[PDB]
Amino acid sequence: SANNPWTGFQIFLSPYYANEVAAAAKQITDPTLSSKAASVANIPTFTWLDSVAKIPDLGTYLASASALGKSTGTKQLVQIVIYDLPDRNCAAKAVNGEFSIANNGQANYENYIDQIVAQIQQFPDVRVVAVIEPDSLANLVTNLNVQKCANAKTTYLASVNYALTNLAKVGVYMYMDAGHAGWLGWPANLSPAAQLFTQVWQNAGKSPFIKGLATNVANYNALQAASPDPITQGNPNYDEIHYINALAPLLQQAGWDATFIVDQGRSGVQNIRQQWGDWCNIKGAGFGTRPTTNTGSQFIDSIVWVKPGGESDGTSNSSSPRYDSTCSLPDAAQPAPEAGTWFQAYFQTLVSAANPPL
């Protein structure tokens, strides 16, 4: 499109990831690998607002970005993930997230959005790009037979609508999470996906700030694969570019000339999964293509690093109340710590296996 949110902007670099990476890098013993690892702190990532407790951090990042732009003669851009739906991750095994549908979850989520909006409103010289609720809408396409998802459907739709409607009022550029090629990119899932995303876009007023969709978030697919990963057999859309090329025209026909961003933060190594649906701490992953607006596709505004490589997808300890058995599969790196916490051995391999090399 004409207006790529990133062009002309300096991305604010997460200080939390920089510190996590800094603490991680001094533990890497090989000096050549250590300096490569430290440099990852200079690669822009998304900050996940996975709880209300993260909202004050957003406030500090906006204020720091505002000052840094003035100090360097630049316009700054802060990258966030909205990730706190009630009954979050409905198809996952075991309960995740601080809000539940049964305990005023919708209302609590609205208050979470209101607190985010109230921060963003204070810093109008900073641009914000938000990924909206990974692992949410996509479940309403393919997983309505999952009872937790069926029971969450109206809440997910209302809560995502509230986020889109109210973040638009403070000019946030938004990409709704849309799964990945092996989820919604199956040809038979494309029209159901397009219908759902367009209804969501309509309910939120078709705001021009709703730019489009984010794909491959926290996943491992290629953007453009050299040859299809064996996990993809049966799906002609074997990488993200095929998925996006197929879905984008369906959205255009609805009057939404949608654009896309694609996570490549853990895509450096292909052909590492036994089944396409295996998502947790996949062993041997490497950092992939660094964020760039040089995407190779009319439909893609940016390659991004949404999931911060090195933070665990979930614990492998079956005694944890948060345990998801996907995290103990043969292709999952084990032992792994709780979701969101630092997984040092996994980070070191992401660095060693980076492609392109760091």
CSV table of C-alpha atoms in Angstrom, one decimal, residues 5-329:
chain,number,residue,atom,x,y,z
A,5,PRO,CA,4.0,2.0,8.9
A,6,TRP,CA,7.7,1.4,9.1
A,7,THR,CA,9.0,3.7,6.3
A,8,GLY,CA,10.7,6.8,7.7
A,9,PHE,CA,10.7,5.5,11.3
A,10,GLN,CA,13.3,4.2,13.7
A,11,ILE,CA,12.1,1.2,15.6
A,12,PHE,CA,12.5,1.4,19.3
A,13,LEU,CA,14.6,-1.6,20.5
A,14,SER,CA,13.2,-3.5,23.4
A,15,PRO,CA,15.3,-2.8,26.5
A,16,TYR,CA,14.0,-6.0,28.1
A,17,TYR,CA,15.1,-8.2,25.2
A,18,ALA,CA,18.4,-6.2,25.0
A,19,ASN,CA,19.0,-7.0,28.7
A,20,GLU,CA,17.7,-10.6,28.4
A,21,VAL,CA,20.1,-11.0,25.5
A,22,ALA,CA,22.8,-9.1,27.3
A,23,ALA,CA,22.5,-11.5,30.3
A,24,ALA,CA,22.3,-14.4,27.9
A,25,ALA,CA,25.3,-13.4,25.8
A,26,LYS,CA,27.9,-13.2,28.6
A,27,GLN,CA,27.1,-16.9,29.4
A,28,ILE,CA,28.1,-18.0,25.9
A,29,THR,CA,31.6,-19.2,26.1
A,30,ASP,CA,32.9,-19.1,22.5
A,31,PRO,CA,34.0,-15.5,22.0
A,32,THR,CA,32.9,-15.4,18.3
A,33,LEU,CA,29.5,-16.8,19.1
A,34,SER,CA,29.2,-14.4,22.1
A,35,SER,CA,29.7,-11.3,20.0
A,36,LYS,CA,27.2,-12.5,17.5
A,37,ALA,CA,24.7,-13.2,20.3
A,38,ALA,CA,25.2,-9.8,21.9
A,39,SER,CA,24.4,-8.1,18.6
A,40,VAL,CA,20.9,-9.7,18.7
A,41,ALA,CA,20.0,-6.9,21.1
A,42,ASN,CA,20.2,-4.5,18.1
A,43,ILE,CA,17.5,-6.5,16.2
A,44,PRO,CA,14.0,-5.1,16.7
A,45,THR,CA,11.4,-7.3,18.3
A,46,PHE,CA,7.8,-7.0,19.5
A,47,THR,CA,7.0,-6.4,23.2
A,48,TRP,CA,4.3,-8.8,24.4
A,49,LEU,CA,1.6,-7.2,26.6
A,50,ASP,CA,0.7,-10.6,28.0
A,51,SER,CA,-0.7,-9.2,31.3
A,52,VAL,CA,-2.0,-6.0,32.8
A,53,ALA,CA,1.3,-6.0,34.8
A,54,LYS,CA,3.1,-5.3,31.5
A,55,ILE,CA,1.2,-2.0,30.8
A,56,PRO,CA,3.5,0.3,32.8
A,57,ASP,CA,6.4,-1.1,30.7
A,58,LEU,CA,4.5,0.1,27.6
A,59,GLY,CA,4.3,3.5,29.2
A,60,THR,CA,8.1,3.6,29.8
A,61,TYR,CA,8.8,2.4,26.2
A,62,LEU,CA,6.7,5.1,24.7
A,63,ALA,CA,8.2,7.9,26.8
A,64,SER,CA,11.8,6.6,26.2
A,65,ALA,CA,11.1,6.4,22.4
A,66,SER,CA,9.7,9.9,22.5
A,67,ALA,CA,12.9,11.2,24.1
A,68,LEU,CA,15.2,9.1,21.9
A,69,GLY,CA,13.6,10.5,18.7
A,70,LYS,CA,14.1,14.0,19.9
A,71,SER,CA,17.8,13.2,20.8
A,72,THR,CA,18.5,11.6,17.4
A,73,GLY,CA,16.3,13.6,15.0
A,74,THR,CA,14.1,10.6,14.3
A,75,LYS,CA,10.5,9.5,14.5
A,76,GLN,CA,10.3,6.4,16.7
A,77,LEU,CA,8.0,3.4,16.4
A,78,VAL,CA,7.1,1.0,19.2
A,79,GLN,CA,6.1,-2.6,18.4
A,80,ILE,CA,3.6,-4.4,20.7
A,81,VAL,CA,1.6,-7.6,20.9
A,82,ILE,CA,-1.9,-7.4,22.4
A,83,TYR,CA,-2.2,-10.8,24.1
A,84,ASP,CA,-4.5,-11.1,27.1
A,85,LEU,CA,-7.9,-12.4,25.9
A,86,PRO,CA,-10.1,-14.0,28.4
A,87,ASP,CA,-9.8,-17.8,28.1
A,88,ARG,CA,-6.7,-17.2,26.1
A,89,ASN,CA,-5.4,-20.0,23.9
A,90,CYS,CA,-8.7,-21.9,23.8
A,91,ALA,CA,-7.3,-24.9,21.9
A,92,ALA,CA,-4.2,-25.3,24.1
A,93,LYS,CA,-4.0,-27.9,26.9
A,94,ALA,CA,-4.4,-26.3,30.3
A,95,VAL,CA,-5.5,-22.8,31.2
A,96,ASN,CA,-3.4,-19.7,30.4
A,97,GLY,CA,-3.9,-16.0,30.9
A,98,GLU,CA,-5.0,-13.9,33.8
A,99,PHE,CA,-8.6,-13.4,32.5
A,100,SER,CA,-11.4,-15.9,32.3
A,101,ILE,CA,-14.8,-15.6,30.6
A,102,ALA,CA,-16.5,-16.9,33.7
A,103,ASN,CA,-15.0,-14.1,35.9
A,104,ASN,CA,-15.9,-10.9,34.0
A,105,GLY,CA,-13.2,-11.7,31.5
A,106,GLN,CA,-14.6,-9.5,28.7
A,107,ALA,CA,-15.0,-6.5,31.1
A,108,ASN,CA,-11.5,-7.0,32.5
A,109,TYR,CA,-10.1,-7.2,29.0
A,110,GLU,CA,-11.8,-3.9,28.1
A,111,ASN,CA,-10.1,-2.4,31.1
A,112,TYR,CA,-6.8,-3.8,29.9
A,113,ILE,CA,-7.3,-2.1,26.5
A,114,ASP,CA,-8.4,1.1,28.2
A,115,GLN,CA,-5.2,1.2,30.2
A,116,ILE,CA,-3.1,0.6,27.0
A,117,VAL,CA,-5.0,3.3,25.2
A,118,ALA,CA,-4.5,5.7,28.1
A,119,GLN,CA,-0.8,5.3,27.8
A,120,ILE,CA,-0.6,5.6,24.0
A,121,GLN,CA,-2.8,8.7,24.1
A,122,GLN,CA,-0.1,10.5,26.1
A,123,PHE,CA,2.7,10.1,23.5
A,124,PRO,CA,1.3,11.2,20.1
A,125,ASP,CA,4.8,11.7,18.6
A,126,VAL,CA,5.5,8.0,18.8
A,127,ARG,CA,4.0,5.5,16.3
A,128,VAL,CA,2.7,2.2,17.6
A,129,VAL,CA,2.3,-1.0,15.6
A,130,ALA,CA,0.3,-3.7,17.3
A,131,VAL,CA,-0.2,-7.4,16.5
A,132,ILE,CA,-3.7,-8.3,17.7
A,133,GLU,CA,-4.1,-11.5,19.8
A,134,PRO,CA,-2.1,-14.4,18.4
A,135,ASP,CA,-3.8,-17.7,18.7
A,136,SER,CA,-7.3,-16.3,18.8
A,137,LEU,CA,-9.3,-15.6,15.7
A,138,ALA,CA,-7.5,-18.5,13.9
A,139,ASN,CA,-9.1,-20.9,16.3
A,140,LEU,CA,-12.6,-19.6,15.3
A,141,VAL,CA,-11.9,-20.7,11.8
A,142,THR,CA,-10.7,-24.3,12.2
A,143,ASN,CA,-11.3,-25.2,15.9
A,144,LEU,CA,-15.0,-24.5,16.6
A,145,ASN,CA,-15.2,-28.2,17.5
A,146,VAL,CA,-12.9,-27.5,20.5
A,147,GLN,CA,-15.5,-26.8,23.2
A,148,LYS,CA,-13.4,-24.2,24.9
A,149,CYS,CA,-13.1,-22.4,21.6
A,150,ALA,CA,-16.8,-22.7,20.8
A,151,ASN,CA,-17.6,-21.3,24.2
A,152,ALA,CA,-15.0,-18.5,23.8
A,153,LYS,CA,-16.2,-17.4,20.3
A,154,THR,CA,-18.4,-14.5,21.2
A,155,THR,CA,-15.9,-13.2,23.8
A,156,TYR,CA,-12.9,-13.4,21.4
A,157,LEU,CA,-14.9,-11.6,18.8
A,158,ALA,CA,-16.2,-8.9,21.2
A,159,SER,CA,-12.8,-8.4,22.9
A,160,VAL,CA,-10.8,-8.2,19.6
A,161,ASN,CA,-13.4,-5.8,18.4
A,162,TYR,CA,-13.0,-3.6,21.5
A,163,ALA,CA,-9.2,-3.6,21.0
A,164,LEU,CA,-9.4,-2.7,17.3
A,165,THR,CA,-12.1,0.0,17.8
A,166,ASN,CA,-10.3,1.7,20.7
A,167,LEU,CA,-6.7,1.4,19.6
A,168,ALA,CA,-7.8,3.0,16.3
A,169,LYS,CA,-8.9,6.1,18.2
A,170,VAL,CA,-5.2,6.7,19.1
A,171,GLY,CA,-3.9,5.9,15.7
A,172,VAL,CA,-2.3,2.5,16.3
A,173,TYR,CA,-1.4,0.6,13.2
A,174,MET,CA,-2.8,-2.9,13.7
A,175,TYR,CA,-2.3,-6.3,12.1
A,176,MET,CA,-4.7,-9.0,13.3
A,177,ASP,CA,-3.1,-12.4,14.0
A,178,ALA,CA,-3.9,-14.8,11.2
A,179,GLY,CA,-2.1,-18.0,12.0
A,180,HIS,CA,0.2,-19.4,9.4
A,181,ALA,CA,0.2,-21.3,6.1
A,182,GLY,CA,-0.3,-24.7,7.8
A,183,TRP,CA,-3.2,-23.4,9.8
A,184,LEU,CA,-5.3,-21.0,7.7
A,185,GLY,CA,-3.4,-21.4,4.4
A,186,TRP,CA,-4.9,-24.7,3.5
A,187,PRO,CA,-7.0,-23.8,0.4
A,188,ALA,CA,-10.2,-25.0,2.1
A,189,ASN,CA,-9.6,-22.7,5.1
A,190,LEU,CA,-8.9,-19.5,3.0
A,191,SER,CA,-12.5,-18.5,2.4
A,192,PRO,CA,-13.6,-19.2,5.9
A,193,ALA,CA,-10.7,-17.2,7.2
A,194,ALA,CA,-11.4,-14.3,4.8
A,195,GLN,CA,-15.0,-14.2,5.9
A,196,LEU,CA,-14.1,-14.1,9.6
A,197,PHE,CA,-11.4,-11.4,9.2
A,198,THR,CA,-13.6,-9.2,7.0
A,199,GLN,CA,-16.5,-9.4,9.5
A,200,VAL,CA,-14.1,-8.4,12.3
A,201,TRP,CA,-12.8,-5.5,10.1
A,202,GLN,CA,-16.4,-4.4,9.4
A,203,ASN,CA,-17.5,-4.6,13.1
A,204,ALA,CA,-14.5,-2.3,13.9
A,205,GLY,CA,-15.6,0.3,11.4
A,206,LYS,CA,-13.1,-0.5,8.6
A,207,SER,CA,-10.7,1.9,10.2
A,208,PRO,CA,-7.7,2.6,7.9
A,209,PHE,CA,-5.5,1.8,10.9
A,210,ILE,CA,-6.5,-1.8,10.6
A,211,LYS,CA,-3.8,-2.5,8.1
A,212,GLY,CA,-4.2,-6.2,7.7
A,213,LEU,CA,-2.9,-9.4,9.2
A,214,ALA,CA,0.2,-10.9,10.9
A,215,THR,CA,1.3,-14.4,10.0
A,216,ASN,CA,3.7,-17.0,11.3
A,217,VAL,CA,3.7,-15.3,14.8
A,218,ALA,CA,5.7,-17.5,17.1
A,219,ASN,CA,6.0,-20.1,14.4
A,220,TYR,CA,8.8,-21.4,12.1
A,221,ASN,CA,7.5,-21.5,8.5
A,222,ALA,CA,9.5,-20.2,5.7
A,223,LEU,CA,8.4,-17.0,4.0
A,224,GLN,CA,9.7,-18.4,0.7
A,225,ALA,CA,10.9,-22.0,0.9
A,226,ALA,CA,13.5,-23.4,-1.3
A,227,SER,CA,11.4,-26.6,-1.5
A,228,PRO,CA,8.4,-27.7,0.5
A,229,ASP,CA,9.0,-28.9,4.1
A,230,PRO,CA,7.7,-32.5,4.3
A,231,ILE,CA,5.3,-31.4,7.0
A,232,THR,CA,3.3,-29.6,4.4
A,233,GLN,CA,2.2,-32.5,2.2
A,234,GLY,CA,-1.3,-32.0,0.9
A,235,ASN,CA,-1.2,-28.2,1.2
A,236,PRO,CA,-0.1,-26.3,-2.0
A,237,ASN,CA,0.5,-23.3,0.2
A,238,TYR,CA,3.6,-24.6,1.8
A,239,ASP,CA,5.1,-21.3,2.9
A,240,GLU,CA,3.9,-17.9,4.1
A,241,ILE,CA,4.2,-16.2,0.6
A,242,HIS,CA,1.9,-18.8,-0.9
A,243,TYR,CA,-0.6,-18.4,2.0
A,244,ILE,CA,-0.6,-14.5,1.7
A,245,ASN,CA,-0.8,-14.5,-2.1
A,246,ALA,CA,-3.9,-16.7,-1.8
A,247,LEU,CA,-5.6,-14.9,1.1
A,248,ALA,CA,-4.9,-11.3,0.1
A,249,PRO,CA,-7.2,-11.2,-2.9
A,250,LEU,CA,-10.1,-12.5,-0.9
A,251,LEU,CA,-9.8,-9.6,1.5
A,252,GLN,CA,-9.4,-7.2,-1.4
A,253,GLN,CA,-12.7,-8.3,-2.9
A,254,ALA,CA,-14.4,-7.3,0.4
A,255,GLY,CA,-13.1,-3.8,-0.1
A,256,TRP,CA,-10.2,-4.3,2.3
A,257,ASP,CA,-6.9,-3.9,0.5
A,258,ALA,CA,-5.1,-5.6,3.4
A,259,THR,CA,-1.4,-5.9,3.9
A,260,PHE,CA,0.7,-8.3,6.0
A,261,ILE,CA,3.6,-8.7,8.3
A,262,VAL,CA,5.4,-12.0,8.7
A,263,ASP,CA,7.3,-13.3,11.7
A,264,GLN,CA,10.7,-14.8,10.7
A,265,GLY,CA,12.4,-14.6,14.1
A,266,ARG,CA,12.7,-18.4,14.4
A,267,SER,CA,12.5,-19.4,10.7
A,268,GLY,CA,16.2,-19.7,9.8
A,269,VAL,CA,16.1,-23.5,9.9
A,270,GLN,CA,13.5,-25.3,7.9
A,271,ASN,CA,12.6,-29.1,7.9
A,272,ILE,CA,12.9,-29.4,11.7
A,273,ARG,CA,9.3,-30.6,12.6
A,274,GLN,CA,7.7,-34.0,12.6
A,275,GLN,CA,4.2,-32.5,12.2
A,276,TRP,CA,3.2,-29.1,11.0
A,277,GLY,CA,1.1,-28.5,14.2
A,278,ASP,CA,4.1,-28.9,16.5
A,279,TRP,CA,4.7,-25.4,17.8
A,280,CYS,CA,6.5,-25.6,21.2
A,281,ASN,CA,10.2,-24.8,21.5
A,282,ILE,CA,11.0,-26.6,18.3
A,283,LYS,CA,14.5,-28.1,18.5
A,284,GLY,CA,17.2,-26.7,16.2
A,285,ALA,CA,15.4,-23.5,15.3
A,286,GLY,CA,17.6,-20.6,14.1
A,287,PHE,CA,17.1,-16.9,13.9
A,288,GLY,CA,15.7,-16.1,10.5
A,289,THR,CA,15.6,-13.1,8.1
A,290,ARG,CA,16.1,-9.9,10.1
A,291,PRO,CA,13.2,-7.4,10.1
A,292,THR,CA,13.0,-5.4,6.9
A,293,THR,CA,10.5,-3.8,4.6
A,294,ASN,CA,12.3,-5.4,1.7
A,295,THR,CA,9.8,-8.3,1.7
A,296,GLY,CA,9.6,-9.4,-1.9
A,297,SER,CA,5.8,-9.1,-2.1
A,298,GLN,CA,3.3,-6.4,-2.9
A,299,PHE,CA,1.2,-7.7,0.0
A,300,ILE,CA,3.8,-7.7,2.8
A,301,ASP,CA,4.8,-4.4,4.6
A,302,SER,CA,7.5,-6.0,6.7
A,303,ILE,CA,9.3,-9.1,7.8
A,304,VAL,CA,9.3,-8.8,11.6
A,305,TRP,CA,10.5,-10.7,14.7
A,306,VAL,CA,7.3,-10.9,16.8
A,307,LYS,CA,8.0,-13.8,19.1
A,308,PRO,CA,11.3,-13.0,20.8
A,309,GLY,CA,13.6,-15.9,20.2
A,310,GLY,CA,15.0,-17.3,23.4
A,311,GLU,CA,11.8,-16.9,25.4
A,312,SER,CA,10.2,-20.3,26.0
A,313,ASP,CA,6.9,-21.2,24.4
A,314,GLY,CA,6.0,-23.3,27.5
A,315,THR,CA,7.3,-25.7,30.1
A,316,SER,CA,8.1,-29.3,29.5
A,317,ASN,CA,7.4,-30.2,33.1
A,318,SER,CA,4.2,-32.2,33.2
A,319,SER,CA,3.6,-31.2,36.9
A,320,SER,CA,3.2,-27.5,36.0
A,321,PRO,CA,-0.4,-26.2,36.1
A,322,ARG,CA,0.4,-24.5,32.8
A,323,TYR,CA,1.8,-27.6,31.1
A,324,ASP,CA,0.9,-28.3,27.5
A,325,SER,CA,1.9,-31.7,26.3
A,326,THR,CA,3.0,-30.2,22.9
A,327,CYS,CA,6.0,-29.0,24.8
A,328,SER,CA,7.2,-32.6,25.5
A,329,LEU,CA,6.9,-33.9,21.9
